[PDB]
Amino acid sequence: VNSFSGYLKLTDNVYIKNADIVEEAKKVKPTVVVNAANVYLKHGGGVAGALNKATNNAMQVESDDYIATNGPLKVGGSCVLSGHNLAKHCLHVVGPNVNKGEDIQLLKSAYENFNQHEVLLAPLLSAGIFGADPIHSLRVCVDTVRTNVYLAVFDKNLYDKLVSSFL
Ligand SMILES: O=C(O)COc1c(Cl)cccc1Cl
């Protein structure tokens, strides 16, 4: 049993809810919250800007030190950093950004990072301002992640559309 509440069960391991991931993280304090990161860990908007704002910019300060030491992530890659006031850990995952021309095949590689964690609170990778089709992102998630993932869809229409169209 875990603390996640109000989710619709899609599969053995994937759950979904219409929720603000920031508000959900603050309520649950999960072991792992996933950030929709870019390779520079520049957290300006969408999930990353919202998560970072909720940490009072401490996520960005930590991230800048990570990049200064290690250099940029790979598209499809990830790093584990602090979850600050939101979670124990934040798994920063870089899905491909369609609005930068990145290979959508890298979305599966991005989701494979989730398999290193038994339970996660996450957004749909490459959705929102990363420009991918969220229906596609949910299909890749279900077909790639084997650990228990609790998805936070920000848009109600998409939440209502993702459920209705789910095979
Ligand atoms: O709902 C999501 O989580 C991602 O997609 C979005 C977002 Cl973030 C905002 C407006 C519309 C859509 Cl379809």
How far apart CA 162 and CA 34 sit, in angstroms, is: 20
Rounded alpha-carbon distances, angstroms, from residue 135 to 127, 128, 153, 158, 159: 9, 12, 11, 8, 10
Task: Please give the distance, rounded to the nearest whole angstrom, from the Cα atom of residue 128 to the centre of ligand 1.
Answer: 5
Neighbours of 145 (CB within 10 A): 21
Neighbours of 98 (CB within 10 A): 16
Helix (H) or strand (E) holding 148, with range, is strand 148-153
Backbone φ and ψ of 127, nearest 5°: -85, 180
Of all protein residues, whose CA lies closest to atom 11 belonging to ligand 1?
155
Q: Could you give the residue ranges of the DSSP H alpha helices within the chain?
A: 21-28, 46-54, 58-70, 106-112, 134-144, 156-164
Of all protein residues, whose CA lies closest to atom 8 belonging to ligand 1?
128
- Residues touching ligand 1 (Cβ under 6 Å) are 123-124, 127-128, 134, 153-155, 158
Query: What's the resolution in A?
Result: 1.0
Closest CA to 106 of 64, 138, 77: 77
The method recorded for this entry reads X-ray
